[PDB]
Amino acid sequence: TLTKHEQDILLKELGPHVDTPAHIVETGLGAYHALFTAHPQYISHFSRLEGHTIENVMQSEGIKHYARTLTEAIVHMLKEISNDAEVKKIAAQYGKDHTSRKVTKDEFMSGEPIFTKYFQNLVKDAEGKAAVEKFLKHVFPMMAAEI
């Protein structure tokens, strides 16, 4: 399980990106710009991104909705990342948000390297970039097991 120290480093270094509603949305938008630039065929899987392609998805109203839900799901797991039983419970809930959707388990896991690089570019030092990678490597398989 991640240590309380690692939880503290993550919360401290990601704090300026998740401290206001506007910051939450800008952090999420960056994650989707990375995910869809690598895999633009994933836009079609999200119901509110109907009618859009890579040329115009980032300007949509629907992408702002998912920017908040993705980022706030991540911050909920970060807040409990040193509590093994709670983060496993939370991650199971977020994985279950994907079971009946159009996304495959392989597509879901393809987000790991993209979100790791993106979130690592938001933090300031190597310790925090390593914690971001450890965090995502721990929660991605918990969520993916529900898919």
Ligand code: HEM
């Ligand atoms: C850190 C990893 C991830 C987290 C925490 C996460 C979290 C979520 C959450 C909370 C929802 C529900 C959205 C809502 O309330 O509207 C959702 C939906 C969904 N996610 Fe993820 N997700 C992650 C990775 C991915 C990846 C890599 C994909 C790949 C395409 C993906 C595809 C989807 C799809 C297709 C939906 C359903 C959206 C709809 O049809 O409106 N997720 N995800």
